[PDB]
Design a protein around this ligand. Structure first.
Ligand SMILES: COc1ccc([C@@]2([C@]34C[C@H]5C[C@H](C[C@H](C5)C3)C4)N=C(N)N(C)C2=O)cc1
Lengths: 310, 610
């Protein structure tokens, strides 16, 4: 293993992110035992994961990792339990992971992070009910929003619009944001207040439609202009923790859940693929930019499964 | 100041506790299991998750778990969730976290109240309390303002409720009230009041008066920045801190350091600065420090103001009865009823020297133990001037009728509640123009709200007697964590001497108390005013309270079942002073807004022996 990197990796894997070159970024957190800390890992060989001895770069953070997002090609944005948003810069030789900034602004655990389309700004959702717009260059908070009434579950930046981003919380609210408005938040509500929203995913091509998964295991396809649900399917038996689109021109939707199962859906939300490979909670999923048929998933069972979607 | 640090992130339990102890925190509020560690107990393969489930108990000593660690329920545990699967998992996890807290031996465990429905959260907690009797406390996290009424006005289509909502602003108290009512007023369930950025209206903060608050959660976000650059609080926020310090609550600091240039110790330094700069406690506050809210079923020589008034009353009575030209020929015969240790006898002698008049004293006392003190006093100091009477007053015939009869209303040697009956049976050995000290006394009633006191009376259930006899009897109590709902109104008055042809001490009073606030009636506070002579008076009524009089505390008449009172509603109380030939008792009932049972009928639970 490289220098400064820890000898052992934490059992619970929270995040898996594919870099445009093909490398895999891993986010592990200790949720049981003597030390409840976190760690950041880089793998140029995705098949070598989760083995510590065969990694490109590795580092240990002060606390566990709740969410992770790539900042360009060398920056790593960390959503920590300490209530701090961390930025970890990759080495020139890409062998070490150095801490650029660690700002404690959120009063509770930072549960979700999403980098805005410019790559110079990012949004963070925490259990303190607050949402913060960060400036990655000056290392400061531009605006502190408190629109929700409960803990912010998920934050998702618009694919190309910088002012636009989505946020959901345990207060049954889905908010469409726009920093260009004096009142940025806009409650994109449904025909009836059903189950709590848990996951958010923007469509790559259609900048007006999005998908959200609820706590009952249902994934819904909603258009922003139509402001009402038209199509939904009971994908899982437990809470939908994540939703990720493929890099295809016509993308496939990968649904993640607490029922320890993966599911790949089309435009009509119909099931195409399913994997029971994980014996624990499925956390993150990323498609390979080199092979659009390959999809990598991680869980709390310390498993790094590589799937072949037909 | 007893204070603690709240943290939802603890990577190293040994290093984190050492760091918060360095800042000056007496305890630590931390999660027993990782907040993000979501457990499954019903569905496979997540059900068969390999352990451990949390950090080992050996990582801290038993002494540290019992005094330095306060438990915290995981935020994902939602027993009242609309999804059956989350509901069942949260049920099993809540028990797992509560049982682990009792296994550690934690003095307190934190559970949140962040919605209207917490019925299943109450059910699971009540079951944990009834599964083995223990001393472990449960602090309910309730904010002063709900987060829905605290949110920023930034949602375009859904703006904040700008309209007036009197009952809507008090919704957070109803969350706590419904929860504790479901748990049947358990002494193991207390309030951990969270203070928001902007404080609510004074009526909302007044709902928490009489509530069992054991902790005050203060976030770093509510702290303002002073001209120097240190964390401070607004004058209105400081007002609540002074009120909370008197209640002796444990202030808890939550959230990350916003004043990053200064350590977490600066937040605590300001709270300790407020306690050292608080108003000083008066003679009444300094006397009963450990007697606060402790009720006793129905010390006196240590009150100099009480006897100074009696001395002035006798001094004024003597001058008005005998003029300057008769300061040697006319001798005034004074009769001290219930002389006790002789403080009223000494005050009668001090007044005669002050008025420069001739007096003949008679120290009447039935208690033979006090007669020993009086007979030793009338031999070593008083002499032939004082004649100690220990004989049965009904049989005993006075050598001459008395000019002034001096007596105390309440005391260990006084007749207390039987003051009218005893003075009526003593006015026969008093002259036709005779003066009684006190000459008049009036009782006062006021409706009170105290969930803390109602629970203290509820705990007074004894074996070999009625299970509701504790509510059918008055209590001498130092009114601390309570709330007076309306101004005290006069109940009944007695005048002495009473030259009425038919002297009847039986009373029946109807009092209507207008209440301008939403509340819960728990009982009635009894006060009194007494006229010794002319302008010289003694009073325990808060409006006309005698300065420095700690000898007498207010009495409390509780009710079996608490009554909900709305804004604008009137509390109608019916009080009866019942007098038989063998006993005297008090009967009371509530008629508005709702009816209650007549308390203590025939004096079954409480009676004063005539
Ligand atoms: C409405 O029913 C009440 C019944 C009793 C009381 C009082 C006395 C005291 C005193 C003067 C008055 C008559 C007698 C003698 C009783 C009031 N008894 C006590 N212990 N206290 C503190 C009182 O004020 C007050 C209200």
């Amino acid at each position: 293993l490289p220098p400064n990197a820890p000898a052992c990796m934490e059992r619970q894997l929270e995040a898996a992110r594919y870099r445009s070159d093909g490398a895999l970024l891993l986010g592990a957190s200790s949720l049981s035992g003597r030390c409840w800390a976190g760690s950041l890992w880089l793998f140029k060989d995705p098949c070598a994961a989760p083995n510590e001895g065969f990694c490109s770069a590795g580092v240990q953070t002060e606390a566990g990792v709740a969410d992770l997002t790539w900042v360009g090609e060398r920056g790593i944005l960390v959503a920590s339990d300490s209530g701090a948003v961390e930025l970890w810069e990759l080495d020139e030789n890409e062998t070490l992971i150095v801490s650029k900034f660690c700002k404690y602004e959120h009063d509770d655990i930072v549960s979700t992070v999403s980098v805005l389309s410019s790559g110079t700004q990012a949004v963070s959702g925490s259990k303190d009910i607050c949402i913060k717009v960060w400036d990655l260059a000056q290392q400061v908070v531009l605006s502190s929003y408190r629109a929700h009434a409960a803990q912010v579950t998920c934050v998702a930046a618009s694919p190309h619009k910088d002012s636009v981003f989505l946020s959901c919380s345990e207060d049954n609210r889905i908010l469409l944001w726009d920093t260009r408005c004096p009142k940025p938040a806009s409650q994109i509500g449904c025909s009836a207040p059903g189950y709590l929203p848990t996951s958010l995913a923007w469509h790559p091509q259609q900048s007006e439609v999005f998908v959200f998964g609820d706590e009952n295991g249902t994934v819904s396809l909603v258009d922003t202009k139509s402001t009402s649900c038209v199509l939904s399917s009971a994908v899982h038996s437990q809470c939908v923790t994540g939703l990720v689109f493929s890099p295809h021109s016509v993308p496939f939707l990968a649904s993640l859940s607490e029922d320890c199962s993966l599911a790949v859906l089309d435009s009509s939300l119909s099931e195409l693929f399913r994997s029971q490979a994980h014996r624990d909670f499925v956390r993150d999923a990323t498609w390979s930019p080199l092979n659009h048929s390959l999809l990598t998933t991680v869980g709390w069972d310390h498993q790094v499964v590589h799937h072949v979607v037909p | 100041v007893s204070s603690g640090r709240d943290l939802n992130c603890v990577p190293e339990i040994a290093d984190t506790l050492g760091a918060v102890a360095k800042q000056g925190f007496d305890f630590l509020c931390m999660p027993v299991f990782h907040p993000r560690f979501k457990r499954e107990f019903i569905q496979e393969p997540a059900k068969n998750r390999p352990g451990p489930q949390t950090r080992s108990d050996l990582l801290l000593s038993g002494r540290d778990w019992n005094t330095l660690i306060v438990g915290k329920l995981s935020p994902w545990i939602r027993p009242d969730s609309k999804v059956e699967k989350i509901r069942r998992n949260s049920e099993a996890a809540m028990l797992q976290e509560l049982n682990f807290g009792a296994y550690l031996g934690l003095p307190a465990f934190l559970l949140p109240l962040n919605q209207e429905d917490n019925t299943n959260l109450a059910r699971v907690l009540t079951n944990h309390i009834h599964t083995g009797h223990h001393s472990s406390m449960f602090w309910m996290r309730v904010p002063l303002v709900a987060p829905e009424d605290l949110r920023d006005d930034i949602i375009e289509n859904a703006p904040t409720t700008h309209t007036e909502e009197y009952s809507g602003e008090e919704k957070t108290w109803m969350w706590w009230h419904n929860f504790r009512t479901l748990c049947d007023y358990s002494k193991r369930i207390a309030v951990a009041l969270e203070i928001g950025a902007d404080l609510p209206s004074n009526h909302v903060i007044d709902r928490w008066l009489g509530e069992p608050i054991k902790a005050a959660i203060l976030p770093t976000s509510i702290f303002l920045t002073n001209k120097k650059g240190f964390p401070v609080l607004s004058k209105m926020h400081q007002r609540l801190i002074f009120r909370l310090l008197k209640l002796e609550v444990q202030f808890i600091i939550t959230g990350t350091n916003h004043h990053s240039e200064k350590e977490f110790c600066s937040y605590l330094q300001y709270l300790e600065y407020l306690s050292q700069n608080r108003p000083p406690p008066n003679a009444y506050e300094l006397f009963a420090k450990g007697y606060e809210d402790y009720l006793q079923s129905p010390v006196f020589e240590k009150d100099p103001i009480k006897y100074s008034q009696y001395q002035q009353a006798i001094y004024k009575c003597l001058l008005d009865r005998v003029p300057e030209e008769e300061k040697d020929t006319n001798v005034q015969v004074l009769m001290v009823l219930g002389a006790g240790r002789g403080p009223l006898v000494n005050a009668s002698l001090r007044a005669a020297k002050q008025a420069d008049r001739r007096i003949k004293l008679y120290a009447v006392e039935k208690n033979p133990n006090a007669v020993v003190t009086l007979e030793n006093w009338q031999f070593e100091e008083w002499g032939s001037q004082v004649t100690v009477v220990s004989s049965d007053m009904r049989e005993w015939v006075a050598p001459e009728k008395a000019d002034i009869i001096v007596s105390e209303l309440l005391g260990s040697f006084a007749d207390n509640e039987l003051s009218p009956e005893c003075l009526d049976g003593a006015q026969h050995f008093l002259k036709d123009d005779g003066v009684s000290i006190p000459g008049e006394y009036t009782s006062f009633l006021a409706p009170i709200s105290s969930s803390k006191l109602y629970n203290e009376v509820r705990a007074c259930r004894e074996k070999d007697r009625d299970p509701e006899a504790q509510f059918e009897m008055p209590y001498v109590v130092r009114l601390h964590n309570f709330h007076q709902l309306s101004a005290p109104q006069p109940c009944f008055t007695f005048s002495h001497p009473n030259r009425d042809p038919m002297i009847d001490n039986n009373r029946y009073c109807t009092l209507e108390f207008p209440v301008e606030v939403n509340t819960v009636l728990h009982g009635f506070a009894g006060y009194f005013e007494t006229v010794l002579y002319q302008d010289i008076t003694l009073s325990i009524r808060p409006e006309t309270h005698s300065p420095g009089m700690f000898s007498w505390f207010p009495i409390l008449f509780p009710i079996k079942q608490p009554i909900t009172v709305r804004e604008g509603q009137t509390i109608c109380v019916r009080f009866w002073r019942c007098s038989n030939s063998k006993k005297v008792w008090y009967e009371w009932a509530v008629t508005a807004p709702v009816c209650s049972a007549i308390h203590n009928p025939t004096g079954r639970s409480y009676t004063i022996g005539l």
